[PDB]
Structures are given as structure tokens and as C-alpha cells.
Amino acid sequence: VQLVESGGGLVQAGESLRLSCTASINIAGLAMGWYRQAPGKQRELAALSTNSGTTIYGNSVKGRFTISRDNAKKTVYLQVDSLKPEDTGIYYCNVRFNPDRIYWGQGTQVTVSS
């Protein structure tokens, strides 16, 4: 029902980046994650944190980032590293409970300086 994001694009090739998201709802029983939307293609899933002690990771980027699940608050983290040019695009983030109900986030764009 609410969503807020914090992060910056315009990052150099290979360096790190810290993005964050917040909301007005507990995370208990809510798996939260990040999707990638590059030019063209389609909005795909970067990686998310399971409800109970697990973290799913997008196959395309293995060992790419960290889910950094927040508890008692709403602050998701990625810990970007080895930023390459292909990382440019929108990074959506959202929490979906049950199929057909995900309350899509707004996402934040990130560029890759060559």
C-alpha cells in the first residue's frame, strides 16, 4: 500500500552500489525482492529473500549481489559489486504476498559509465 526507495545510478564500471527500499508494513510473511528491467527485453527477477531462512538468486547474475533482508524495519539491500555495463536499466523492488497481489514498486534507474 506504500513504497519508498533510495539509491543512485551513474556508477563507474566495476564499483559497488547500495540501494534500499522501505514501506509501511511488517516483513513477516512477506517475501521481498528485486527485479531487473533493462532496455527492451522484459521486467525480470534479480533476486529475492524467502520468507524463512533462504534467498533466491537470479541465475543470470550468480554471486552478484546480496539480499540483506531487513527485519523490524523495511530496508532491503543489494551490495552491488563488479558493476559491469550490462547492469544499466531500471531496478524494480517489491513485496508480493500470494499470486495476483504484489503491489508493484516504482523502481530506480541505474546507469553504467564506461
Partner 1 sequence: QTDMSRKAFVFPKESDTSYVSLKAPLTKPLKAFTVCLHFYTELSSTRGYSIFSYATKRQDNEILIFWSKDIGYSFTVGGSEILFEVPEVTVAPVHICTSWESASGIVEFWVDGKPRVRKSLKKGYTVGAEASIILGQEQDSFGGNFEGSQSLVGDIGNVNMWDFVLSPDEINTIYLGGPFSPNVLNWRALKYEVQGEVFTKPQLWP
Residue type, 15: E
Using rule CB under 8 A, residue 63 touches partner 1? no
CB atoms near residue 81 (< 10 Å): 13
Name the binder of 63 from a second copy, partner 1, none, CB < 5-8 A by kind.
a second copy
Using rule CB under 8 A, residue 90 touches partner 1? no
CB 104 within 8 A of CB 32: no
CB atoms near residue 62 (< 10 Å): 8
Q: Which of 50, 51, 54, 60 forms a contact with a second copy (CB under 8 A)?
A: 60
**From 26-34, 37-45, 50-58, 97-105, span contacting a second copy (CB under 8 A):** 37-45
CA distance 1 to 100: 15
Using rule CB under 8 A, residue 100 touches partner 1? yes
Kindly determine how many residues on this chain lie close enough to bind a second copy according to the rule CB under 8 A.
20
Using rule CB under 8 A, residue 99 touches partner 1? yes
